[PDB]
Each structure stands twice: as C-alpha cells, then as structure tokens.
Amino acid sequence: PSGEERCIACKLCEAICPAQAITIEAEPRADGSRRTTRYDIDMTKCIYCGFCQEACPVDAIVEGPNFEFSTETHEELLYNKEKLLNNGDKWEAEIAANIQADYLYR
Amino acid sequence: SGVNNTKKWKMEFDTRERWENPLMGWASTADPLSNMVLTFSAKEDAIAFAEKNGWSYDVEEKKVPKPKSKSYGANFSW
C-alpha cells in the first residue's frame, strides 16, 4: 500500500517458471534496499500455470483475471517491469479482493 | 561445504558467443551445444564417449583434498 514495490528479486519468481520466461536482473536500488532493475515475462512463452504467484513469498507477482489483452503485434506481449507494475497499479482494487477471497484456501 | 556435487565426471563443451537480443536485452546464442553437460562415472567412460562422437577432449585429473590431520587439543598447547 505504502507504494513500495513488493518484488525483492528473489529470482524464485522465475526459477520454477517451466516455460523459462522470466529474467529479473537486480541491484541495490541506491536506498540500500533490494529491488529489481529488470523484470520480464515473455507472454508468448508463459503458460498461465500460476507457479509464480504461489512461490512468491511476498505476493508480488500475481496472475490477474484479465483475459482480454490480445495484441496486433509480437512486441506488446514481451511485458517489462513497467507494463506489469502499472498493470498492477490498475487491477489492485480487483486483485486484492480475490486474494483476500482465496488466501485461506492457499 | 557439500561434496556431493564433486563425485561424477562431466563432459562440458567450449563457451561460444553469448550476446544480447537487441529488442528486449536478453542473452541470445547460436551454439546449439551450449547447455550440454553429459555426466559419466569415470575418466575411462568419458574419453570413450568423446572419441566415440568425434569431439576433442581436454581431460583434467580429479583433485580430492589430501588427508589433513585434525586434533581438538592441539590448539591448547602453548
């Protein structure tokens, strides 16, 4: 909520990704904190298996309820950290309800 | 300090170009035999496979730590 990205570049986010889709090169962010400089999904390799939302120990990467995001080009599917973070700056009213709705079962 | 990953002989190939995809900045490559690490169980069985397939080899002898004698009391002498 404060506004601090939840991703702490554990690289676990992509370790389990079986389609080998994620590259999250990181640095100390010059606050002394630990955050990504790089994050990636190639959405033309991902399989919507959710092994990234259940491995994340912080609930940073999720897999939202969109399914109307078709694109006329190949480049609009290679999401970067800023098409996923403002993406997450969009559906957070709609994600958190579903997380809070399923957290117990998970 | 686990020694379970230093017990079987591996046959890895040379390291060729690992470059950057202009569009996304990923690492790209043209070496089909780059991620190849065959695992054998003895020098003899690795040299055989390489000779079998026509590759050039550079065997490196094993480096087991020699025995170093350790005693608790020794550090109490003066």
Binding site: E25, E27, T37, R38, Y39, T71, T73, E75, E76, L78, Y79, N80, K81, E82, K83 | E20, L23, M24, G25
Partner: peptide, 27 residues
C-alpha cells in the same frame, strides 16, 4: 462494487559495460 499507445519493450539494464572514451586532444 493505429493507436499510438502501444507497449514497446526495453532493455531495462543500465548497459552493463563501459568503453574507453578516447583522449579528447591529440599528443
């Protein structure tokens, strides 16, 4: 409870290398 805004990728990486810049004035 044609569009120009098309996602375009980056290499958000800080360039990871530095070339010697030649000396500015000759010798």
């Amino acid at each position: 409870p044609a569009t120009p805004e098309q996602y375009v990728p980056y290499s958000t990486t800080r360039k990871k290398i530095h070339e010697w810049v030649p000396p500015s004035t000759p010798y």
